[PDB]
Amino acid sequence: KVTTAYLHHMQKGKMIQPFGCLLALDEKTCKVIAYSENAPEMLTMVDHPALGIGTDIKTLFTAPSASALQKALGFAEVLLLNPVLIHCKTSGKPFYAIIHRVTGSMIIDFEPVKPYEVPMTAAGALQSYKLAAKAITRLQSLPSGSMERLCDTMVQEVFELTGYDRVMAYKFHEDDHGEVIAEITKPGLEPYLGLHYPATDIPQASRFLFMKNKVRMIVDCHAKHVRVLQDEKLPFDLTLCGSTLRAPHSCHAQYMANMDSIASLVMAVVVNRKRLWGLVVCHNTTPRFVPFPLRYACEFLAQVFAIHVNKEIELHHHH
Amino acid sequence: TTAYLHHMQKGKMIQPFGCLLALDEKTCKVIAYSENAPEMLTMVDHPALGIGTDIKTLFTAPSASALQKALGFAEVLLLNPVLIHCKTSGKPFYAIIHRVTGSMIIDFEPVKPYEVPMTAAGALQSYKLAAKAITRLQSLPSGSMERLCDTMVQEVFELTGYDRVMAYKFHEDDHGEVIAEITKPGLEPYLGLHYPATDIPQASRFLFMKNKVRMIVDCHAKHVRVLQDEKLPFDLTLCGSTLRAPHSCHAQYMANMDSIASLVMAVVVNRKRLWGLVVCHNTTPRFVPFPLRYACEFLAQVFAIHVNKEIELHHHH
Ligand SMILES: *[C@@H](C)[C@H]1/C(=C/c2[nH]c(/C=C3N=C(/C=C4\NC(=O)C(CC)=C4C)C(C)=C\3CCC(=O)O)c(CCC(=O)O)c2C)NC(=O)[C@@H]1C
Ligand SMILES: *[C@H](C)[C@H]1/C(=C/c2[nH]c(/C=C3N=C(/C=C4\NC(=O)C(CC)=C4C)C(C)=C\3CCC(=O)O)c(CCC(=O)O)c2C)NC(=O)[C@@H]1C
């Protein structure tokens, strides 16, 4: 009755963050069946309009960019290699396109790229993964035996990789209440280390979605949300909660503003079936954007952290 | 010794899969170019490309200013590769940058133009595969150099797609041994074969300490000459170039052994010495993009750390 009122509205994810724009394409036609209201301003310059229900993507993007998104329409979810660098046809404006699939639909998140970054996209993708891979080797070379030193290491490595003001390891107890068991902040900041938080601060609906979306980013909790519009011929709502752009629930948004955490990056810590052990939670006291390549690299660092956590659990229950 | 080093340094030949420019460390103008650079970068007064060419006339403006930026950064701060576009064609290359005394050296490796959208994605996937391989090396139980080496050649085989991958160990007398090997089915195994120290001379062994990954696309390809301004106050070395051509003796050696292509990773243990090489061979030509060779560099460093540990745990017990 509480899980199903939150879950219905998050799963539809009809409100996005304005740092990016969203398209949904029909797998058969390759045409637009849903768009964020900012997508026309972001992807075109202001018949048809340039961008609505039925728009062909050969009108929006340069020919190699349109052809790579058309080819993505033929791949299993698991075989998608993100992100795709696309260019808009008129402006030459660049974006990272992040693709995911929901049955016959292909959902694209567009995150702008500074045009001076275009030449360095492979270079910066490699550097982000290298730095994460080095963090992985420091986690592996720790002596076994201490959940505390493993979590301290992780928040130190994530703090240096992501540049956020605060990074904590947030553990879920048996009763679903949480505890901050590791923490590093910049010098001004109030410490949360060792505090315990009620289960209802993180409802089951968010818990469920972190099993599937392993990295969630909120750029600015005070940003004006943007509405996604869908094809009126669809007799159900599209599921958009897989979007990197999904807006926080208004209650979480206020919770963030309350706590002076304007921005956040959260990585799911899933142990082997599967359990959500906890979250790696990064906060910023001002707005913050990190590009897809670095959030991708963080996914893998978080999966390796999950493996080491689960081994420290097995070495608790032995000894 | 100094006869091999003169010819692999000063030789001035590159492999034709790419082209080379050297730019003066202050003017940022061309002081050396491979003879294929004009056709490959311009679609062949002044010509479009010679000694003195300004890079602003060869590449689009964002491409030229990403190179101008590298000109002001220490070798240690260089993030490779830069994606560049040629000015009229829009033809794209990976530009791999390294510094010598007077100069910035750029290796240009072609990118299929319809693959430009997938460059970041392909780079992340190459590193992710290598990162997964790293976690499989670390989760091995200690005690077995054989299991350590078998794993490495299996991970390198699945990452690079070559016909054959071997771990080649240097003995105390510098002769080599194939101690691990994975091939595609139907190939003769070279596992356990011992080869003389002269098959890999000191010269090559020295240079693998500095250049950790070396690719030869086709041992039969026609080498292309690098031309420099004869007034340049030093000789350009190409030892650091990804494009450097193999000595004609190695190229014959490869053809004899039915390895038309190779990819070799130095295994350096701690002072430092060259423990061995991870050697990939192919029966036909093979090109692998820079991101994948870069990710193999890190995988090979990590393998070297675990090799070194199995050595210390042998000395113990
Ligand atoms: C309002 C009705 C109730 C509520 C709702 C709510 N919470 C979330 C999600 C999250 N809540 C937290 C909580 C914390 N962040 C912290 O830093 C700390 C201190 C350590 C806590 C306790 C977190 C991390 C999340 C995940 C949010 C993310 O995506 O980064 C949601 C889901 C929001 C969404 O749309 O994702 C909701 C609806 N929270 C309350 O406190 C009220 C009781
Ligand atoms: C010619 C007069 C002599 C010679 C010279 C030579 N060898 C190399 C470099 C390499 N040689 C090997 C040898 C092997 N490759 C194999 O697959 C095997 C079987 C396991 C062996 C023993 C290798 C791996 C290299 C590295 C080549 C590379 O750079 O990828 C060189 C250097 C070539 C260059 O220009 O870099 C030279 C000059 N080889 C002979 O057999 C003659 C005695």
UniProtKB/Swiss-Prot annotation, chain A:
What are the residue boundaries of the GAF domain, all occurrences included?
A: 195-315
Q: What keywords tag this UniProt record?
A: Chromophore, Photoreceptor protein, Phytochrome signaling pathway, Receptor, Repeat, Sensory transduction, Transcription, Transcription regulation
Give GO terms for biological process.
Answer: detection of visible light; protein-phycocyanobilin linkage; red, far-red light phototransduction; regulation of DNA-templated transcription
PTM (free text): Contains one covalently linked phytochromobilin chromophore.
Look up the domain of life of the source.
Eukaryota
**Chain residues that bind phytochromobilin:** C251
Subunit composition and interactions = Heterodimer between subunit A and subunit B.
Name the family. Answer: Belongs to the phytochrome family.
What is the purpose of this protein? Regulatory photoreceptor which exists in two forms that are reversibly interconvertible by light: the Pr form that absorbs maximally in the red region of the spectrum and the Pfr form that absorbs maximally in the far-red region. Photoconversion of Pr to Pfr induces an array of morphogenic responses, whereas reconversion of Pfr to Pr cancels the induction of those responses. Pfr controls the expression of a number of nuclear genes including those encoding the small subunit of ribulose-bisphosphate carboxylase, chlorophyll A/B binding protein, protochlorophyllide reductase, rRNA, etc.
Q: What is this protein called?
A: Phytochrome A-2
Q: What is the lineage of its organism?
A: Eukaryota, Viridiplantae, Streptophyta, Embryophyta, Tracheophyta
Gene from which the chain derives: PHYA2
